Design a protein around this ligand. Structure first.
Ligand SMILES: O=[N+]([O-])c1ccc(O[C@@H]2O[C@H](CO)[C@H](O)[C@H](O)[C@H]2O)cc1
Ligand SMILES: O=[N+]([O-])c1ccc(O[C@@H]2O[C@H](CO)[C@H](O)[C@H](O)[C@H]2O)cc1
Ligand SMILES: [Mg+2]
Ligand SMILES: [Mg+2]
Ligand SMILES: [Mg+2]
Ligand SMILES: [Mg+2]
Ligand SMILES: [Mg+2]
Ligand SMILES: [Mg+2]
Ligand SMILES: [Mg+2]
Ligand code: NA
Ligand code: NA
Ligand code: NA
Ligand code: NA
Ligand code: NA
Ligand code: NA
Lengths: 1011, 204, 193
């Protein structure tokens, strides 16, 4: 039959989909959500054998264990056990596009398990097996007899094994196909793996049983009253003595309870459903669910006889909340949401696509701690526990059908084809049947990157018809088609339009107002956090707060999809596309997360936390105005801390209780403060701290902060006349300056400071020279490749202009002695193919104090691409333990990604000054720095800098962080100006004009002295 | 042009049409019809089938057609004749002036139906005036109403020809047979003959 | 596989639906809607045998004509030839309501046709068979090899027979089931044939 090459056959003998069941036989255990004896896990050690194609599988396997098999843990992805290589391809399918066929060489995983089953399970009732996730298709046999087949790697497939099992030892055999016609609908940008990767369980249900239940909560106009409506269906023999009771609990208190026999109301001319019943419970003053306060009740559905004997019970957590779109705004409990979201794939660097509770909880906690309130299931239904966690910790969820056909040409080739309507429909209908009772799910999505076809419009209406309680969205086909209730583009920019034919990506502000448009706009993906990225993130948040209909978005994305590999020595390292011999591949495009695969944050995470803060502030005189962006809670676990510092030195601080209503304001008057003692800029910093621990944060958690400059007293104090006068020694080849035990040497042929000595000790390994380039970030490279250059990418414009090859030509080098100092003047031109790209003019003034003042004036030709930076660099001879600076920090920050950093005095170990992006590039800059200290050296000015053991040359030549080696000394890059890093996307130049170094003439000045 | 979908004997009538597992089979009945007949000018309206209640499969399919062929309205009478799966109020056997307020799926007088609160669609009966035997009494009342009310745009009489079949007696002479005449049981007897013409096309 | 008791299988190997085609090789003919030499009718006399269930059909029939068969005209409804009774039921289904299953006694009409194909059709191009209406489901074999399956008694089922025919005489075999899961979607108030 080759059922895996027939989209008309997506399953054989599979049971209907339904919400999570446990068949408790005690109502109290159902109420408390405790483990049920009727739901057993088959996770653990199974037997496994890999074959290159299903035709190579021996028939003996059905009957008995293959001796060549291995024992492995399940769930698992067989690539993570080394049987075959995982493949990282973004859009291009990993198999030839020839629907609905797949390669003849089709890796087949043969799994089997020998296990016991109790007679009590067989003597009565139904025993089914549930596979929560099998990638991508499989056949199942039990005791050598064929049971069924299933597709859709992301939803559970269930089969009745009652007639196949015998008391005692039984054997399951599961033949899993890597590729199937289901693969055509699973072309998401992630590793392509296979296997039994989610839980396997056995569920025992009585013959007369609850087969489905739907829970709805509707409200009066001010939410003070609600009706809980539970529709329950049964399977089995109907009898008049059967009953259903639905009871609603708030903690240990029973709030409401209703019982009825089966028999629904008349539906049409033929009657009603004799096998269903609807219970309606009134609830006064319900405690409402939201991500701010995830209040939950518990609904227990009991199937029993009139005499009171329980047959079984099912249950769910219930959150009373209404989601609706009105007048162009997405409302939750009648208030307009501001979605601080993120897309999150299910990925573990060691386990592949297998999800565990600990990792899920870790992700949730980091999210909430970083001011996220929503998550999109990019791009498939998630492991079941995820929804339980979102319901209880409080996150709004976009649940998305497992349908993505990005690699088709055009993109909607299958979704516009009615013959693919059945397969697509099962991916949407079965997701809704499974997840519709979870309160955390607020929006349904029809999939991702599958163009817009008529099958989408058909499925959009299906959902609207079966579940009016949640909007439906879908981005394909231009983001604002008839299959979406929300304008939900990916990577549309804030102000800049990108008018692509047929599917333009308008500026979001403009998109809202196109003729006739009225819907809310929430980006399904925005700000691509690949590498050193998130440049311009604040621009999105300023727009979301200014425009009511701009209701936020889901950042792309949570966690890097890197995998662990082991070197010769056995030590681990982070791998990306192509590192497993997979080809074609899309290299580092699988790492776009705010966090590394192991959950350590990237510096961009802090920028997201600050821009997504729930408190906004303004200052006016001694008054600070705090505004709350919570919709539902008062600030009952928050106090404000404030501190006034001069150049890093604290002068005054205090604390004030915060009592701000949702959407309200609180004015706080600061106490008059004494004038400061010395010159300098006073800075006010405020932080919102939560004194009490919560389910997702520890006591002391800082949830929001803001700084402002207050008075500045400029220094007019005339230094103090130096004790000595530096001496100039001139020679044919050098200008040397001596002062005390210090000496500086300027080479007359190069025109740079080639060496500096403290006593007899050299301080430089490489001379101090201008630098106009940076080791290219992922955003500078884009999709450019050696094999296929993108001439529009920044790195290619710089290469082509000769920025990385230009060499300094000396124009002038003179020395003059002044009353109390020696002055060196230099001029250099940087040229390429006879073009002058940059001209750098400098003065070095060395005084009796031993300080060397450097003035730099650079000219940049107008027609050359704007440069990555305008600074100086050198390799210092020594290495020191710490770095201390007065500037923005403490974490890495760039011009277009520095809002979260604060101006203060920071001190970190040297390695914290290097950010270990898996794909190395320019990294670790800190901007807004007025003073930097390293070993005995101090640089003062108004600059940006980075400092580490790796040269820009090395970073640019190295593609994996594990292969970097510390160079001798310390490389210091000190910039008067540095280009933004961009990130609205990582495939087209995205650094905004205001962050490009296009001024033509630049000036900066630095003082280098010893401390 | 009407899809080959009728599940009238289910209880309730939409038991299959509201079941997603049956969406694929129903879908092929609708889509393959449109792909074959969409270039005929005579087809002016598509129909989703007949007497299969109103289920979510119907709303999905109504939208599919509206998306692939905006040139023709879509109608469907199941579930009360005026659901979200029909661009035309298209009742069967609703009377001219008399309401028949059945629960859940009332059959209003056609004149009254057009003006129920919020209603704005045209009304064309998918079936009206049951021509079984000596019948068609009251036919003129429908026509007077269609001509007086703009939005009453007519209807399709039930039906054209008797479904009688020929059998031969012991002398070999032919005779017209109806339900139960072939030993078929249960059967619905003469209800198979409701036409304006006899099975051989002679008019009634 | 009992494909006729599975609403998830409504066809196997069937070609996409499309508007009426005739593959004219002369544009003037296409303008005037004249008969096309590329569109041949297989209507006329076929071989037919009735059985009470698909389990009763002998395997030999796939390969050769059953001597017991009769010759009958096609298209036809086998009830009109007297092989079994037509049923007139309005609303109540003619089979027990137990979807998607049908009775085990399920009248099976076995139709076959021996017909010629010119080599010119087989040297190049695609030769397909078109069944405009088969009630209610069926399997098709050509020269003893299984080709495909179809449901929906009121739309055409088409199959590519290019890789199954040979120049000269060929034999089709069509096993028609009276009842199938498609019957649950065909409860119109009319004779059940
Ligand atoms: O430059 N391209 O040709 C190009 C084509 C498709 C692209 O798709 C983009 O890739 C991203 C990489 O992380 C994400 O997968 C995103 O969902 C997708 O739109 C991105 C760039
Ligand atoms: O009286 N009944 O119970 C009853 C139930 C269903 C009926 O259905 C009616 O039968 C007619 C008979 O020619 C047509 O088939 C019509 O489409 C159908 O609505 C008619 C009467
Ligand atoms: Mg398949
Ligand atoms: Mg994609
Ligand atoms: Mg590649
Ligand atoms: Mg009768
Ligand atoms: Mg079937
Ligand atoms: Mg021959
Ligand atoms: Mg009927
Ligand atoms: Na807004
Ligand atoms: Na990616
Ligand atoms: Na407080
Ligand atoms: Na690099
Ligand atoms: Na009229
Ligand atoms: Na009738």
């Amino acid at each position: 039959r080759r059922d895996w090459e027939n989209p008309g056959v997506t399953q054989l003998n599979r049971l209907a989909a339904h919400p999570p069941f446990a068949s408790w036989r005690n109502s109290e255990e159902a109420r408390t959500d405790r483990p049920s004896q009727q739901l057993r896990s088959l996770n653990g050690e199974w037997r496994f054998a890999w074959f290159p194609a299903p035709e190579a599988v021996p028939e003996s396997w059905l009957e008995c264990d293959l001796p060549e098999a291995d024992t492995v843990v399940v769930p698992s992805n067989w690539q993570m056990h080394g049987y075959d290589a995982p493949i990282y391809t973004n859009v291009t399918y990993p198999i030839t596009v020839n629907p609905p066929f797949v390669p003849t060489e089709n890796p087949t995983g043969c799994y089997s398990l020998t296990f016991n089953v109790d007679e009590s399970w067989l003597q009565e009732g139904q025993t089914r097996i549930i596979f929560d996730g099998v990638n991508s298709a499989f056949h199942l046999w039990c005791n050598g007899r064929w049971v069924g087949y299933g597709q859709d790697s992301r939803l559970p497939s269930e089969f009745d094994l009652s007639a196949f099992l015998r008391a005692g030892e039984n054997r399951l055999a599961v033949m899993v196909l890597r590729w199937s016609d289901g693969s055509y609908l699973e072309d998401q940008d992630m590793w392509r793996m296979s296997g039994i990767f989610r839980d396997v369980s056995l569920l025992h249900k009585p013959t007369t049983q609850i087969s489905d239940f739907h829970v709805a909560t509707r409200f009066n106009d001010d939410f003070s009253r609600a009706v809980l409506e539970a529709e329950v269906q049964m399977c089995g023999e109907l009898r008049d003595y059967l009953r259903v009771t639905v009871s609603l609990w708030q903690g240990e208190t029973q709030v409401a309870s209703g019982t009825a026999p089966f028999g629904g109301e008349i539906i049409d001319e033929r009657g009603g459903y004799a096998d269903r019943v609807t219970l309606r419970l009134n609830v006064e003053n319900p405690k409402l669910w939201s991500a701010e306060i995830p209040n939950l009740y518990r609904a227990v559905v009991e199937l029993h006889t009139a005499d009171g004997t329980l047959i079984e019970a099912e249950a769910c957590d219930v959150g009373f909340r209404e989601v609706r779109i009105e007048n162009g705004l997405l409302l939750l409990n009648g208030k307009p949401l501001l979605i601080r979201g993120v897309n999150r794939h299910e990925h573990h660097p060691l386990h592949g696509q297998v999800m565990d509770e600990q990792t899920m909880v870790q992700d949730i906690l980091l999210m909430k701690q970083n001011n996220f309130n929503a998550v999109r299931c990019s791009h498939y239904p998630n492991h079941p526990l995820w929804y339980t966690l979102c319901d209880r910790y409080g996150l709004y969820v976009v649940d998305e059908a497992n349908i993505e056909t990005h690699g088709m040409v055009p993109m909607n080739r299958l979704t516009d084809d009615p013959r693919w309507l059945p397969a697509m429909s099962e991916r949407v209908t079965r997701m809704v049947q499974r997840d519709r009772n979870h309160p955390s799910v607020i929006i349904w999505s029809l999939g991702n990157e599958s163009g817009h076809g008529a099958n989408h419009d058909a499925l959009y209406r299906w959902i609207k018809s079966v579940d009016p309680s949640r909007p439906v969205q879908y981005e394909g086909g231009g983001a604002d088609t008839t299959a979406t209730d929300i304008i939900c583009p990916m990577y549309a920019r804030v102000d800049e339009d990108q008018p692509f034919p047929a599917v333009p990506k308008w500026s979001i502000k403009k998109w809202l107002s196109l003729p006739g448009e009225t819907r809310p706009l929430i980006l399904c993906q925005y700000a691509h956090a690949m590498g050193n990225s998130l440049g311009g993130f604040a621009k999105y948040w300023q727009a979301f707060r200014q425009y009511p209909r701009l209701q936020g978005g889901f950042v792309w994305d949570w966690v890097d999809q890197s995998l662990i590999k082991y070197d010769e020595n056995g030590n681990p390292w982070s791998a990306y596309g192509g590192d497993f011999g997979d080809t074609p591949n899309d290299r580092q495009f699988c790492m776009n997360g705010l966090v590394f695969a192991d959950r350590t944050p990237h510096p961009a995470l802090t920028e997201a936390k600050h821009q997504q803060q729930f408190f906004q502030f303004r200052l006016s005189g001694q008054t600070i105005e705090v505004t709350s962006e919570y919709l539902f809670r008062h600030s009952d676990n928050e106090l404000l801390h404030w501190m006034v510092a001069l150049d890093g030195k604290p002068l005054a601080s205090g604390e004030v209780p915060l009592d701000v209503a949702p959407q309200g304001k609180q004015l706080i008057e600061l106490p008059e403060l004494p004038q400061p003692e010395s010159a300098g800029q006073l800075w006010l910093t405020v932080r919102v701290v939560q004194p009490n621990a919560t389910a997702w944060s520890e006591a002391g958690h800082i949830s929001a902060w803001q700084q402002w400059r207050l008075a500045e007293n400029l220094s007019v104090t005339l230094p103090a006349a130096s004790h000595a006068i530096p001496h100039l020694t001139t020679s044919e080849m050098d200008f040397c300056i001596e002062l005390g035990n210090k000496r500086w040497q300027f080479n007359r042929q190069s025109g740079f400071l080639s060496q500096m000595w403290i006593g007899d000790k050299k301080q430089l390994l490489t001379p101090l020279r201008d630098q106009f380039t940076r080791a290219p970030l992922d955003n500078d490279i884009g999709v450019s490749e050696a094999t296929r250059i993108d001439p529009n990418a920044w790195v290619e414009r710089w290469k082509a202009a000769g920025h990385y090859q230009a060499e300094a030509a000396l124009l002038q080098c003179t020395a003059d002695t002044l009353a109390d100092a020696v002055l060196i003047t230099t001029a250099h031109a940087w040229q390429h193919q006879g073009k002058t790209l940059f001209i750098s003019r400098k003065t070095y003034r060395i005084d009796g104090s031993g300080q060397m003042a450097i003035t730099v004036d650079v000219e940049v030709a107008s027609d050359t691409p704007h440069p990555a930076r305008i600074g100086l660099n050198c390799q210092l001879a020594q290495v020191a333990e710490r770095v201390n600076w007065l500037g923005l920090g403490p974490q890495e920050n760039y011009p277009d990604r520095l809002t979260a950093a604060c101006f203060d005095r920071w001190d970190l170990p040297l390695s914290d000054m290097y950010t270990p992006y898996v794909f190395p590039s320019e990294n670790g800059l800190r901007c807004g720095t007025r003073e930097l200290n390293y070993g005995p050296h101090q640089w003062r000015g108004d600059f940006q800098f980075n400092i580490s053991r790796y040269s820009q040359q090395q970073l640019m030549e190295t593609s994996h962080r594990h292969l970097l080696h510390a160079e001798e000394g310390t490389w210091l890059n000190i910039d008067g100006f540095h280009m933004g890093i961009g990130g609205d996307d990582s495939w087209s130049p995205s650094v905004s004009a205001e962050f490009q170094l296009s001024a033509g003439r630049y000036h900066y000045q630095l003082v280098w002295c010893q401390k």
